[PDB]
Design an enzyme around this catalytic site. Structure first.
Site, PDB file in Angstrom:
ATOM      1  N   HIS A   1       0.543  -1.503  -0.090  1.00 30.30           N
ATOM      2  CA  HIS A   1      -0.224   0.408   0.212  1.00 30.30           C
ATOM      3  C   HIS A   1       0.867   1.333   0.089  1.00 30.30           C
ATOM      4  O   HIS A   1       1.547   1.659   1.228  1.00 30.30           O
ATOM      5  CB  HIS A   1      -1.418  -0.194   0.944  1.00 30.30           C
TER       6      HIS A   1
ATOM      7  N   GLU B   1      -9.633  -3.403  -5.767  1.00 33.70           N
ATOM      8  CA  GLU B   1      -9.921  -4.595  -4.723  1.00 33.70           C
ATOM      9  C   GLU B   1     -11.045  -4.166  -4.071  1.00 33.70           C
ATOM     10  O   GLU B   1     -11.493  -2.727  -4.084  1.00 33.70           O
ATOM     11  CB  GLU B   1      -9.148  -5.239  -4.056  1.00 33.70           C
TER      12      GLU B   1
HETATM   13  O1  LIG Z   1      -4.628  -7.856  -1.023  1.00 36.38           O
HETATM   14  C1  LIG Z   1      -3.720  -7.300   0.706  1.00 36.38           C
HETATM   15  C2  LIG Z   1      -3.544  -8.217   1.381  1.00 36.38           C
HETATM   16  C3  LIG Z   1      -3.169  -7.819   2.520  1.00 36.38           C
HETATM   17  C4  LIG Z   1      -2.602  -7.514   2.641  1.00 36.38           C
HETATM   18 CL1  LIG Z   1      -1.860  -7.201   4.279  1.00 36.38          CL
HETATM   19  C5  LIG Z   1      -2.241  -5.841   2.156  1.00 36.38           C
HETATM   20  C6  LIG Z   1      -2.116  -4.369   2.157  1.00 36.38           C
HETATM   21  C7  LIG Z   1      -2.417  -3.912   2.042  1.00 36.38           C
HETATM   22  C8  LIG Z   1      -2.996  -3.718   1.240  1.00 36.38           C
HETATM   23  N1  LIG Z   1      -4.157  -5.320   0.395  1.00 36.38           N
HETATM   24  C9  LIG Z   1      -3.473  -5.804   1.250  1.00 36.38           C
HETATM   25 MN   LIG Z   2      -5.320  -9.193  -2.254  1.00 32.42          MN
HETATM   26 MN   LIG Z   3      -5.215  -5.970  -1.758  1.00 29.05          MN
END
Ligand SMILES: Oc1ccc(Cl)c2cccnc12
Ligand SMILES: [Mn+2]
Ligand SMILES: [Mn+2]
Length: 365
Positions: free
Chosen positions: A229, A254
């Site tokens: 991020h 997402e």
């Molecule tokens: O899609 C993700 C899966 C797993 C984690 Cl830790 C995330 C952290 C920030 C943004 N997206 C994420």
């Molecule tokens: Mn993800």
């Molecule tokens: Mn993500």
């Protein structure tokens, strides 16, 4: 050729070192109606694009490993398997196809397999006896990287057709977000298009009706090198910041749908941890706390990791040392994010490259 089950790394499948491009799209037009078609043939845009070719090629290798892993996952994921068995079978394949090599190539984050009301960040810790059930709604969220170029891509797994319309709502909103995204497009604009499409759907689950809600405190984000991020958030509801998407950026698009409250809170035991990117070097004398941070810096750097990945490295009695790093602000915990008990959450996610010439949905073939 690739084996069944897959064991041949993507690198070995393309001897020339040129990986397949994902789906390419023309950018969305402006409010007055001016097309972005000019980018596709501009000398100045093609020059900037070719300059970052080695980088796009890194996301493509990582994306091709992700496609072959998730097709393989879809072929055997069944109720009755424990959450440890699912994650280990998935990760073992992911490691082989990405040709895991320390910090240069590997798993960008732990295998999320969040169930039912838990929307995200759930992966089993050692001794977790949870078994996938026929009525479960499982979000498979895993990441791959080549030289820190991360593919963040997720999908929802169900066995009961009662959730089909719930999955369809979220899939359609994710496609909407991918379509709306582009250079100079406001982030709040992408968020309103997503909400408008998600709320148009109505579902019936076990004689109960719901209008699909976007999870308002969950959202898309920008991606940086070795940074999941990178600071820019893509909202999935109206109300977000009017900040704009820029050229050369990478975004994870997402969206989340829920039959619950449409908001998530921290719940259950934490499995996901990540070193804080803005924290520099911190000298540590506490021997066990010092050792654990050196293990983190060597194996994960600023990429997320889970406790199972610490056990895997032969580490033990590290919970206090890990808690110490969390309280010191060197490591941040990322606990499971759940909506209300009895609610159902679904997720779909792709990675998009904001290339100077076109928009590449790099994680989609
Ligand atoms: O899609 C993700 C899966 C797993 C984690 Cl830790 C995330 C952290 C920030 C943004 N997206 C994420
Ligand atoms: Mn993800
Ligand atoms: Mn993500």
């Amino acid at each position: 050729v690739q084996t069944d089950p897959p064991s041949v790394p993507i690198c070995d499948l393309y001897p020339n070192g040129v990986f397949p491009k994902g789906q390419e799209c023309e950018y969305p037009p402006t409010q007055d109606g001016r097309t972005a078609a000019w980018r596709t043939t501009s000398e100045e845009k093609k020059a900037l694009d070719q300059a970052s070719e080695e980088i796009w090629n890194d996301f493509r290798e990582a994306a091709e490993a992700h496609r072959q892993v998730r097709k393989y996952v879809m072929s055997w994921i069944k109720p009755g398997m424990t959450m440890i068995e699912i994650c280990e079978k998935l990760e073992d394949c992911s490691r082989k196809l990405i040709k895991e090599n320390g910090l240069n190539a590997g798993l960008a984050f732990p295998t999320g397999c969040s169930l039912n009301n838990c929307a995200a960040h759930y992966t089993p810790n050692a001794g977790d006896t949870t078994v996938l059930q026929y009525d479960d709604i499982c979000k498979i969220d895993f990441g791959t990287h080549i030289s820190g170029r991360i593919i963040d891509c997720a999908f929802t797994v169900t066995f009961n057709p009662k959730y089909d319309t719930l999955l369809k709502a979220v899939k359609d909103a994710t496609n909407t977000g991918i379509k709306c995204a582009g250079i100079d497009v406001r982030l709040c604009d992408v968020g309103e298009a997503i909400q408008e499409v998600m709320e148009s759907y109505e579902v019936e689950i076990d004689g109960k009706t719901y209008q699909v809600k976007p999870i308002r405190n969950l959202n898309g984000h920008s991606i940086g090198q070795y940074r999941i991020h990178a600071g820019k958030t893509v909202p999935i509801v109206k109300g977000g910041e009017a900040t704009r998407m820029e050229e050369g950026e990478v975004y994870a698009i997402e969206t989340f749908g829920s039959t619950g409250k449409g908001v998530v809170h921290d719940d259950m035991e934490c499995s996901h941890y990540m070193k804080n990117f803005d924290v520099g070097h911190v000298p540590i004398r506490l021997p066990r706390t010092k050792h654990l941070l050196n293990v983190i810096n060597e194996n994960f750097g600023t990429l997320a990791f889970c406790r199972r990945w610490l056990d895997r490295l032969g580490e033990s009695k590290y919970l206090m040392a890990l808690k110490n790093l969390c309280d010191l602000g060197i490591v941040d915990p990322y606990p499971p994010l759940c909506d209300i008990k009895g609610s159902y959450t679904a997720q779909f996610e792709h990675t998009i490259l904001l290339r100077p010439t076109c928009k590449e949905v790099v994680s989609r073939g």
